[PDB]
Design a protein around this ligand. Structure first.
Ligand SMILES: *[C@@H]1O[C@H](CO)[C@@H](O[C@@H]2O[C@H](CO)[C@@H](O[C@@H]3O[C@H](CO)[C@@H](O)[C@H](O)[C@@H]3O)[C@H](O)[C@H]2NC(C)=O)[C@H](O)[C@H]1NC(C)=O
Ligand SMILES: *[C@@H]1O[C@H](CO)[C@@H](O[C@@H]2O[C@H](CO)[C@@H](O[C@@H]3O[C@H](CO)[C@@H](O)[C@H](O)[C@@H]3O)[C@H](O)[C@H]2NC(C)=O)[C@H](O)[C@H]1NC(C)=O
Ligand SMILES: *[C@@H]1O[C@H](CO)[C@@H](O[C@@H]2O[C@H](CO)[C@@H](O[C@@H]3O[C@H](CO)[C@@H](O)[C@H](O)[C@@H]3O)[C@H](O)[C@H]2NC(C)=O)[C@H](O)[C@H]1NC(C)=O
Ligand SMILES: *[C@@H]1O[C@H](CO)[C@@H](O)[C@H](O)[C@H]1NC(C)=O
Ligand SMILES: *[C@@H]1O[C@H](CO)[C@@H](O)[C@H](O)[C@H]1NC(C)=O
Ligand SMILES: *[C@@H]1O[C@H](CO)[C@@H](O)[C@H](O)[C@H]1NC(C)=O
Ligand SMILES: *[C@@H]1O[C@H](CO)[C@@H](O)[C@H](O)[C@H]1NC(C)=O
Ligand SMILES: *[C@@H]1O[C@H](CO)[C@@H](O)[C@H](O)[C@H]1NC(C)=O
Ligand SMILES: *[C@@H]1O[C@H](CO)[C@@H](O)[C@H](O)[C@H]1NC(C)=O
Ligand SMILES: *[C@@H]1O[C@H](CO)[C@@H](O)[C@H](O)[C@H]1NC(C)=O
Ligand SMILES: *[C@@H]1O[C@H](CO)[C@@H](O)[C@H](O)[C@H]1NC(C)=O
Ligand SMILES: *[C@@H]1O[C@H](CO)[C@@H](O)[C@H](O)[C@H]1NC(C)=O
Ligand SMILES: *[C@@H]1O[C@H](CO)[C@@H](O)[C@H](O)[C@H]1NC(C)=O
Ligand SMILES: *[C@@H]1O[C@H](CO)[C@@H](O)[C@H](O)[C@H]1NC(C)=O
Ligand SMILES: *[C@@H]1O[C@H](CO)[C@@H](O)[C@H](O)[C@H]1NC(C)=O
Ligand SMILES: *[C@@H]1O[C@H](CO)[C@@H](O)[C@H](O)[C@H]1NC(C)=O
Ligand SMILES: *[C@@H]1O[C@H](CO)[C@@H](O)[C@H](O)[C@H]1NC(C)=O
Ligand SMILES: *[C@@H]1O[C@H](CO)[C@@H](O)[C@H](O)[C@H]1NC(C)=O
Ligand SMILES: *[C@@H]1O[C@H](CO)[C@@H](O)[C@H](O)[C@H]1NC(C)=O
Ligand SMILES: *[C@@H]1O[C@H](CO)[C@@H](O)[C@H](O)[C@H]1NC(C)=O
Ligand SMILES: *[C@@H]1O[C@H](CO)[C@@H](O)[C@H](O)[C@H]1NC(C)=O
Ligand SMILES: *[C@@H]1O[C@H](CO)[C@@H](O)[C@H](O)[C@H]1NC(C)=O
Ligand SMILES: *[C@@H]1O[C@H](CO)[C@@H](O)[C@H](O)[C@H]1NC(C)=O
Ligand SMILES: *[C@@H]1O[C@H](CO)[C@@H](O)[C@H](O)[C@H]1NC(C)=O
Lengths: 112, 416, 431, 126, 120, 423
């Protein structure tokens, strides 16, 4: 998955590019899908980033493969399938961690 | 030890059904519709394709029907044609079978009651010397606007942002299963929306061998689509030099009638070289036997109007032909000309196709066949109808997927 | 807590009243079935707002106005691609149908003949059909009630106009606040408020005077009106028990299909297989008497415990009880249901049938309801009433009432707009 | 329907607790013949973007909670932190100070413009 | 709003916010399309800034140098006696060279930051 | 000189010429009021901005033209089609105290019309203008068999209430404030506006009614002054008031023509029958031409004799609508003599209107009930040209004369420039 992620921009850019109602539906949908993904990154504290670290530990429940093998002789398509039943879980955890982190920062900033 | 890392731009996709749009390179209904003007090899991708579950086919079927109705809708409705019609036969310099093929009819159109006359083909008129125009009594017949062209032009289907089209490059892909040579495109190759039955005209050829495809090769209820690796040229003509007669209907409303034929009357026909056909059919059977068994000798049979005869739109005029003799220097297929057209498989509204002045000649490429099944040796017959198979023969290599560029994986880092 | 700073918060749980566009949603050939294209669960989840008091007002509720518009628009859309009966706007020659007819009906049905078009414009045919008296007028030549006003479109026999529950759902950024207060009179503060995405599912039942198949009060009879002392306003009465009513058209009818043009068909009443009997509806006596007494008790609560309450009849569409039973239109008499004075086994209501229906008080449009074959019976639940009021200590109430039918179901809902940004003072400042 | 849970659950709670449920409200924005539905969808997007643009203008992009460098004026509200927080609901707060929101928004933009310039000048060697 | 259009850059660079908020606020299909288009144009510009290290900024400084073949002027020449309209014409070309460079720099910067974070 | 880096700025005040769709707004049964439902006055001066403005290459006019045609065609879609009226009319002369100048003007026509209920016909009659029918006592309607005629719904008003065109988000309208600006070229007094502030969509030929006035001088504009293939648009700095009347007390005869359809016929006229003329003060007209000529001479010479001539062989007359009726006024009494108390002009009336320049899709204008007067302002003229020179009286130009000062531009807020900062 390393080589596959050397650049995350070529596939990130131009996702907003270019009776007749169906053409509007296609355009409206493209915008909505774009915004939904950006919305999710924002609430996880990853706005503006393609790669971000978080404070949610990785569970062996989700996967018990080591970093070797996961990140090398494998790709993203089967990876996504292997952990497809945990995405709701992970997203919920990311949301909770971000909310607590912002509160903690607000308090530290107020204290000094 | 490991933490969740979030990645955006992840190269992952899922099967999806979306709305695709039309594009082209440069009066024609597709030219006024396809206003949008107009590859990447994936090194280790093995994707599953299924041409009979491909919604791109349904999209063409729907778009084409809608485009036709949209174009025919704002044209004169031939209300005053449903009148008692009076007819006699044409006896003027007719080559022996067109005896009884052309009729000379007259009627009173909207004091008004103007008596007019026109010629009709036998297939257009039904008796009650008292006649009625066929099917005008069950549905409205409208006249296609003469300024509208239905000539097929290449159509490219293009993905909306967030979607991509995967293409199978496997030289022998049989319509289903995994494909190990997958590339991505934004737009398909151009497909000409040629409408025909039995023989598929002006499509893309197979690159190495004849490819025989079906949902289930042993199920006789399904059609077999055969893609040839060489084209067969077919020459179709309507030898009669006719003229058109403009008849006023009303306040700027005009009917286009078939006028009198200038010169002799001759039978419409199509022809194919014998050697080419013979070898072509030979190529098909060599490979057809791989699914049905060896120790067999070549044998075909003719068909069971649009399904039993070959049908195409020739030069802008609907043309039908007898394929018997292809399936049983050149072979000539007799042909018939018809007006009052019930498109696809509808039994509702019909279109009146105005005549084209002058002798009509068209030459086209036979690129594939639709065959059905009737030890028991070969027993195959031409099949056809539905017209979705006409697009399956071009779209079989394409699939639409949704890109979902967001996911997670464990990493060694932690946010500070 | 001095030298405080502005902090901006996004995702703040506040809202303001707002009007917007709502979606049609449903559970899991019909006018609403092909409109609600968004699946949703019946009994959608509610989020209770534990310490929220909110102001509700059943009147000036835009949800009602939007529903009224949606129902009419859908009606007109489904009726649009149907056969026009303009060729039927001809002079009729009619006689009386008196073959096997009971009394109180002579003159109700007529045998009418006319010269109709055929598939060809140069041909004519002589056809005949039966018509109901209410739709046929004197110029023994007769005219239809149409032509004098407008054109009539035949309803397509292939599409159902039966109500199904439909749910109204908020667009993103909006929310529906539902009042759970067991007994409020349509206005004022509500102290039990929950948030939902969709309404509970309302059947768009169209009727007059008596409200059928609605949601019952869970406790007591609730009387609601915009202004109870203003005789110009209607009173909506929500019952806590249903009164069951049996409606029927006992005659076994046939349908005569006439081709009038190129794929154009007219569906005429053909003939009657059995005898001719009057359409009617049946209400149990004990149930009605007690139900009405419950209403009276609640009226005394507002009008005095020493007053006299009278129920009188109405002053066609708003005079009789209109409803659609089995797909056929009924105009039933209510006399005898409102025939009493309250101081300190069943009833039969005769019914009339119209075939030509105009709707929502519009004049410029009309629909022809094709006949249906066989015998019609349905059973409905009377869930509420629409009543009106006329120095005196005696007060008379009468049946009455367009939008009231929906206002009575949407009373628990309010639509609000979410306003996620706000600011407040704190001790946090940027470095 | 997993997302629509707890939405406005904190509406009647005090500001002190409600401030911890901002994600829940935020995650229910966007999300959720055919002639009015596109207006409903387009509007949801437009409202969303107007709020995001405004946070961007104020220098709060990407945050649910952002601190500014703008002092609070006692004329907008003369209450102490212990009476606003852990006491009032956000709805009650919104019913107050609603007359000063434009003032606050305007001055927040001016502050950010000063900061954008100061950063450009101080990012330079000086 | 555009009152600063005739002012020189550096003066006309003040209160950029007035021109930003007014990009979103201040048969019927044509109006529906107009609304969609305004949204798409807005987002196309925001994505372009967002893919650079300029998300949420009005003034953004980055690591891409001038090679002095594009502007061909010094700073006194550029930031005085010159409006933004004139400048846009002066360097109307080279636009996409710069955009490509800004993206490459940002991708490299992000990768370097993630390894520095992890390796600590 | 050294160590400079790329920075970007968002919210940069730049723009480019652009083509977009503008939307309509209005200030509070009118056809435009129904369409221009949006309610609606900001203007920002740009102190040091010079900009290029144009005409004839200006697309705002094209949008307005299209919107008007569209609105009219849409407006007539649901109205009664006078299809069953291509019948032979039995027409005699109206002789009821008809004055000498219009002896042959009116016809009394009877015919067999279809009634509702399909089976019966009715004999009805109506009055027609001599310009509405064709003799073949045997008459037929003009051009009813090249096109069906649609009756305008009598309830719809076409009063030209001011129309405001407003920019969509991301766009702005620039205005030229140069008081003497001769149509096109650079303008050094420019401001930005949100809306055009209200243009009355008045439709006319030869004379432009109820438009804008120049503030200081009469302005003469043309794409090519030197050619004879362009119209000259003249904007006056003072209006000329003109009265119009149609003093014939006709009534509306309502005829049911079908199952819910009505035709509105001209009924009997009450009282004597007279012309429907218009009145222009002599001094105002004589001075107005003198003002035009003094400015016109700037392109022709001060020793050049300038003559005004009559119409060349709908357009040879002054077409306008007033009170809902269509007028065709004779302007031959105007535009006379050479340069180096009131005038009364006769007008004709028509009921079948071929709007703009189309052959079919004709409209029937129902008669108005009673008698009307209208008072309008002549604010400009459209003139053409053939030693000495002549000028003669002579649809987009009606709006070019109102929108010459407006331009639409697209805002492009993202800019790039060098400075000394990085990270
Ligand atoms: C298969 O492809 C061939 C080649 O593209 C198609 O032949 C072309 O058919 C069109 C339509 O009839 C011909 O256009 C017409 O040409 C005459 C020439 O006198 C002109 O007067 C007409 O106005 C019109 O432009 C075109 O010339 C002809 N091309 C060639 C090389 O002969 C064929 O129709 C396609 N077959 C099917 C079933 O679609
Ligand atoms: C109030 O709700 C009741 C149901 O709780 C409605 O009564 C039911 O209405 C349906 C729809 O017309 C009837 O279905 C029909 O059944 C016959 C066979 O008997 C079938 O051939 C038809 O195609 C159709 O499916 C149903 O039988 C009937 N129930 C009873 C007890 O008669 C009632 O119509 C609603 N009230 C109003 C005013 O809508
Ligand atoms: C130039 O502007 C003047 C007004 O400044 C226009 O004249 C006015 O036109 C309106 C609409 O035709 C008249 O209103 C109508 O009055 C009758 C009176 O019975 C009423 O029944 C109608 O409902 C309606 O309100 C108005 O009276 C008339 N004003 C004058 C002074 O006569 C004039 O038509 C415009 N010129 C052009 C060419 O558009
Ligand atoms: C998800 O749950 C289903 C339950 O039937 C199971 O079959 C599937 O293998 C699970 N997928 C993963 C990634 O664990
Ligand atoms: C026309 O030919 C058919 C046979 O093809 C015959 O039945 C019919 O009677 C003929 N009609 C006339 C008028 O000769
Ligand atoms: C036209 O109508 C007349 C009516 O007498 C009839 O005799 C004649 O046969 C009709 N002609 C045609 C061709 O229908
Ligand atoms: C297609 O697949 C075959 C599998 O044997 C391989 O040999 C060939 O090189 C592939 N071609 C392309 C273009 O990928
Ligand atoms: C294929 O067709 C044969 C015909 O007898 C049938 O028995 C078999 O079950 C079919 N298989 C599939 C997958 O449809
Ligand atoms: C084959 O078709 C051509 C038309 O292209 C025609 O000229 C020729 O005569 C036909 N062949 C025979 C044997 O008639
Ligand atoms: C079709 O026409 C071409 C010339 O256009 C000719 O070479 C070819 O032999 C013809 N084909 C047949 C089957 O006659
Ligand atoms: C097929 O050929 C046989 C040969 O006898 C013929 O009778 C039959 O009608 C033909 N069928 C079709 C549809 O051409
Ligand atoms: C095929 O048709 C031709 C027509 O001339 C005939 O001569 C030949 O014998 C037939 N062959 C078979 C196998 O039926
Ligand atoms: C309806 O309310 C009355 C109030 O007196 C009560 O007695 C009766 O039991 C209630 N019925 C139901 C079903 O709750
Ligand atoms: C209504 O119909 C039902 C049918 O089961 C019957 O049990 C009930 O008694 C009827 N009620 C009346 C008032 O007729
Ligand atoms: C039916 O209603 C009318 C009033 O519309 C009333 O006079 C008549 O008496 C009622 N029928 C019965 C049986 O009472
Ligand atoms: C409701 O008010 C009480 C008052 O004591 C408070 O304790 C409780 O926490 C409030 N409810 C919520 C959900 O905050
Ligand atoms: C316009 O240029 C003059 C030159 O002297 C300057 O004084 C004035 O401030 C400038 N105005 C603006 C808006 O920049
Ligand atoms: C109307 O029709 C009758 C015959 O029904 C005829 O005598 C009369 O002359 C016609 N009149 C006109 C004006 O057409
Ligand atoms: C059309 O109408 C005109 C009268 O306006 C008449 O002179 C002409 O003969 C008519 N033409 C036709 C084809 O009916
Ligand atoms: C009309 O304008 C062109 C330039 O667009 C110019 O060359 C030509 O000479 C002008 N016509 C006259 C008569 O001067
Ligand atoms: C024009 O002036 C004459 C003078 O006698 C007067 O009678 C007439 O009514 C006036 N007409 C108009 C339109 O003012
Ligand atoms: C036009 O009408 C006005 C009405 O006030 C009148 O004062 C003026 O004199 C009239 N003009 C002419 C030329 O008659
Ligand atoms: C205008 O008035 C002057 C007065 O001297 C006269 O010479 C000239 O001919 C008049 N022109 C017109 C057009 O009336
Ligand atoms: C206009 O008036 C002049 C006055 O001499 C006259 O010659 C001309 O014929 C009139 N115009 C028309 C169309 O009659």
């Amino acid at each position: 998955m390393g080589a596959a992620s050397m650049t995350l921009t070529v596939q990130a850019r131009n996702l907003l590019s270019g009776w007749g109602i169906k053409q509007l539906q296609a355009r409206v949908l493209a915008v909505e899908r774009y915004l939904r993904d950006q919305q999710l990154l924002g609430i996880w504290g990853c706005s503006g980033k393609l790669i971000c670290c978080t404070n949610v530990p990785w569970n062996s429940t989700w996967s018990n493969r080591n970093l070797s093998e996961i990140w090398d002789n494998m790709t993203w398509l089967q990876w996504d399938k292997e952990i497809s039943n945990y995405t709701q879980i992970i997203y919920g955890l990311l949301e909770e961690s971000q909310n607590q982190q912002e509160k903690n920062e607000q308090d530290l900033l107020a204290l000094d | 030890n490991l933490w969740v890392t979030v990645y955006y731009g992840v190269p992952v996709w899922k099967d999806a059904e979306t709305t695709l749009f039309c594009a082209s390179d440069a009066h024609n209904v597709w030219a006024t519709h396809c206003c949008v003007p107009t590859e990447i090899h994936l090194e280790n991708v093995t994707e599953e394709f299924n041409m009979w579950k491909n919604n791109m086919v349904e999209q063409m079927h729907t778009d084409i029907i809608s485009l036709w109705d949209q174009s025919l809708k704002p044209c004169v409705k031939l209300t005053p044609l449903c009148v008692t019609l009076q007819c006699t036969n044409v006896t003027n310099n007719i080559t022996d079978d067109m005896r009884g093929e052309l009729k000379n009819c007259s009627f009173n159109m909207t004091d008004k009651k103007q008596k007019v006359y026109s010629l009709f083909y036998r297939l257009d008129v039904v008796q009650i010397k008292e006649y009625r125009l066929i099917n005008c009594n069950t549905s409205a017949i409208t006249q296609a606007c003469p300024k509208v062209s239905f000539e097929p032009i290449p159509i490219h289907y293009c993905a909306p942002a967030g979607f991509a089209i995967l293409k199978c490059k496997d030289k022998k892909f049989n319509g289903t299963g995994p494909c190990t040579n997958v590339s991505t495109v934004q737009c398909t190759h151009g497909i000409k929306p040629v409408v025909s039955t039995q023989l598929l005209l002006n499509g893309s050829l197979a690159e190495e061998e004849v490819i025989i495809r079906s949902e289930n090769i042993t199920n006789n209820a399904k059609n077999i689509l055969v893609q040839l690796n060489e084209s067969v040229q077919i020459n179709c003509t309507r030898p009669n030099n006719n003229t058109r007669k403009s008849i006023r209907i009303g306040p700027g409303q005009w009917f286009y009638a078939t006028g009198d034929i200038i010169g002799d009357i001759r039978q419409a026909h199509c022809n194919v070289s014998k050697a080419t056909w013979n070898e072509t059919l030979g190529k098909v059977v060599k490979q057809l036997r791989k699914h049905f068994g060896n120790n067999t000798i070549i044998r075909f049979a003719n068909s069971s109007l649009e399904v039993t005869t070959h049908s195409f739109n020739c030069g802008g005029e609907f043309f039908y032909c007898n394929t018997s003799g292809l399936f049983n220097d050149s072979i000539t297929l007799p042909c018939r000309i018809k007006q009052i057209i019930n498109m696809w498989q509808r039994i509702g509204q019909a279109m009146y196709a105005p005549p084209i002045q002058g002798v009509i000649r068209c030459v086209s490429n036979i690129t594939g066949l639709i065959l059905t099944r009737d030890s028991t040796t070969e027993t195959f017959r031409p099949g056809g109808g539905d017209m979705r198979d006409n697009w399956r023969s071009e779209l079989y290599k394409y699939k639409v997927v949704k890109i979902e560029p967001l996911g997670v994986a464990p990493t060694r880092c932690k946010r500070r």
